[PDB]
Design a protein around this ligand. Structure first.
Ligand SMILES: COc1cccc(CCC[C@H](CC(=O)N(C)O)CP(=O)(O)O)c1
Ligand SMILES: COc1cccc(CCC[C@H](CC(=O)N(C)O)CP(=O)(O)O)c1
Ligand SMILES: [Mn+2]
Ligand SMILES: [Mn+2]
Lengths: 410, 410
């Protein structure tokens, strides 16, 4: 019986996790949902608690804490431990009844909860790519100290890569470890991209695209920030750095490939040049499920892939002139140090400015480039606590520098 | 160091094996070629012996035995054990200095050498699919007796399938063992086919096709028998039965898919509905190499797959009306017993009649169909020597029956 906590259970990752858990549990009792954690969605959490009956409930916002206590009195034969804030989150991570934690929260609370899950030697199913890009050095150090802790990737391309690896090799190492690629015989990665809504657009058309164009009739309905990142291909840029950190693959050995059908989710070339790929319909339930079942798989009732119906799969190179965010991501990754932290923070601001019609498409990459050029490399702190503060200071600095650049030109 | 014997070293499989061994050994000394076995080509064997310097040389034809001995006196600092016939082959299989044996011979010598390899508890890299289709029951029985022997698939689609499996699971079972699919969490197989030279012909066009049409402007350098089987899609029919026996996959869970680009070599759907596939250029060096490195991989200098250049991958269902041999293979497999033995034997005759311009395209499937209808199921011998005799007698009967049907409706 797999004992799982869901952090951010009313978000997209959290609700997809509970859906696949429900469906798999109908086939065979595999999962025990031990904890649910949300920001402020009391009614939604109450409804989840009535179905899954977790041992723990937690809610960040303290003004709806007593409302939650009163709601759960309506549930028959059920006496949960009801907690609140960061202290509740810490108590959940330290519980001996929890084996695996799905991190479905963004920004700092994602990183903070990941930190606590690692400190308690848990399996961490991590969907927040920005935390790996920004704080990769810190997570790597924490994983070296807490030897039984593991990060298992949920980001679909990185789940795909992970699924292409031989678990007889994977089990000798773990993600975010030096020498991961060597142990797994990895030569090179094909990192698949949908390409977003702008692949056929000219440079002159790209000059005038708006956030409405990027968000209009999405093929897959996902959040605004990632949709804008998909449009600029900064999503893939961030994912290149994520690949480097998770799998210890050199930047020269990561190739972005535009695959508009989104059936092949990524591919791994091994040292003999054989290539393995993972395929399914574009659906987050498979990557989430594998993060919770690894190193095994369990039965689902998901729709089987019909390759004859799919019929055609296509691949092409992305144009770096048209999608300069990709180039900037590689440059930041290759330069190393805290340049990925700066890239991520400056993109957070630029993405949001574009979303709100404050800047143009190529201003996104212009601002990111300028902030990157404004940063000086820093000696990397050997001390774990100093290193986290260093990352947070640089993050804050880069957001401010991006905002100042905007303000001056405006 | 991996100690290898090559049976049929001057055929297509043998020459590909020695090429990839040579190239891999230039990067790192991995392989010792301990034995080479050929039918007739004494001169070619001498040249191989001069380069590879194997401890054993064997030749099936006794009339060129003395010539080989005299030739080898030319090689400096070299004193091999020089053998001939079935006896020489048995002696090679029984050597404690040999770990892995590549079976690149067909027909009787192929089944015969496979048997002796298994009896001596070797790893057997098996490229002769006809042995598995005709003698699957016997090979299963033999592998149950000889617990440390293993068949590793070399046939490209079956190697692909094998490469899509997690070795943490594969190492708890072995090919041709009951429950192989259950242990590996296999739900379904996509068995990829080139479609062959007649794939786009109308029914009227198919009625007239000749063997010269099948053999003309061939895309890859392979033998006449398999080229004719590719044209009729009986190659894939045989490979369906091969999949069933190697992997214990039910016939209803094997789907033939026409993939004309021959980049994806086959795919495995797991019980969660995630699909894994193996990809490379159509080149037999990868499947051969993997059979000799499994459960590891080693470095090659093969050309890396350029997915952007490949650009497009396509998939469609084959027409059973145009390719009735596929339907016959499923029917024979599903019926079970020795019907696969009869299918293989009757196809051997019908393929050869068509190759030599004695019958038409649809006569191939007609003869096979009639022979299958003439066969009565038999009680399966419990004794392994009786079982081998039973298989061989059914094989002879079915070839004779096919020939007599040809002679009647001449
Ligand atoms: C909604 O579920 C899925 C599952 C798999 C694939 C897709 C297609 C969308 C792919 C990515 C979003 C992403 O980064 N993901 C999902 O990780 C968009 P781009 O950066 O253009 O490539 C959707
Ligand atoms: C020359 O080497 C390779 C290597 C991989 C793939 C191909 C393409 C030819 C595929 C098969 C032959 C076969 O049965 N093989 C190779 O196992 C033909 P059909 O039955 O139409 O599908 C060639
Ligand atoms: Mn992704
Ligand atoms: Mn084949």
């Amino acid at each position: 019986p797999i004992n799982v906590a869901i952090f951010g259970s009313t978000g997209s990752i959290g609700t997809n996790a509970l859906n696949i858990i429900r469906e798999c549990n109908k086939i065979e009792n595999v999962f025990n949902v031990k904890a649910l954690y949300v920001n402020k969605s009391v009614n939604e959490l109450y409804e989840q608690a009535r179905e899954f009956l977790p041992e723990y409930l937690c809610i960040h916002d303290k003004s709806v804490y007593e409302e939650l206590k009163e709601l759960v009195k309506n549930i028959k034969d059920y006496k949960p431990i009801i907690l609140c804030g960061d202290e509740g989150m810490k108590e959940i991570c330290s519980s001996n009844s929890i084996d695996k934690i799905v991190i479905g929260i963004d920004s700092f609370q994602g990183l903070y909860s990941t930190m606590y899950a690692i400190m308690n030697n848990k399996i961490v199913a991590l969907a927040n790519k920005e935390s790996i890009v920004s704080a990769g050095f810190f997570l790597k150090k924490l994983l070296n100290i807490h030897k039984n802790a593991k990060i298992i990737p949920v980001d679909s391309e990185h789940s795909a890569i992970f699924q292409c690896l031989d678990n007889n090799k994977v089990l000798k190492t773990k993600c975010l470890q030096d020498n991961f690629s060597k142990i797994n015989n990895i030569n090179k990665i094909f990192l698949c991209s949908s390409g977003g809504p702008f692949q056929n657009l000219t440079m002159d058309e790209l000059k005038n695209v708006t956030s409405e164009n990027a968000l209009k009739h999405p093929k897959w309905k996902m959040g605004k920030k990632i949709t804008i990142d998909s449009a600029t291909m900064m999503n893939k840029g961030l994912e290149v750095i994520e690949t480097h950190f998770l799998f210890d693959v050199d930047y020269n050995d990561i190739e972005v490939i535009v695959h508009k059908e989104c059936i092949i989710h990524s591919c791994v070339e091994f040292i003999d040049k054989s290539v393995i790929s993972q395929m399914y319909y574009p659906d987050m339930q498979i990557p989430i499920l594998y993060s919770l079942t690894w190193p095994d798989r369990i039965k689902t009732n998901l729709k089987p892939l019909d390759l004859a119906q799919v019929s055609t799969l296509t691949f092409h190179k992305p144009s770096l002139e048209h999608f300069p965010c990709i180039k900037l991501a590689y440059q930041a990754g290759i330069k190393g140090n805290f340049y990925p932290t700066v890239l991520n923070a400056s993109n957070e601001i630029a993405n949001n400015l574009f979303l709100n019609n404050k800047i143009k498409y190529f201003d996104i990459s212009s601002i990111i480039s300028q902030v990157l050029e404004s940063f000086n490399s820093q000696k990397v702190s050997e001390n774990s606590e100093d290193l986290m503060k260093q990352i947070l200071q640089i993050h804050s600095w880069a957001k401010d520098k991006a905002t100042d650049i905007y303000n001056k030109h405006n």
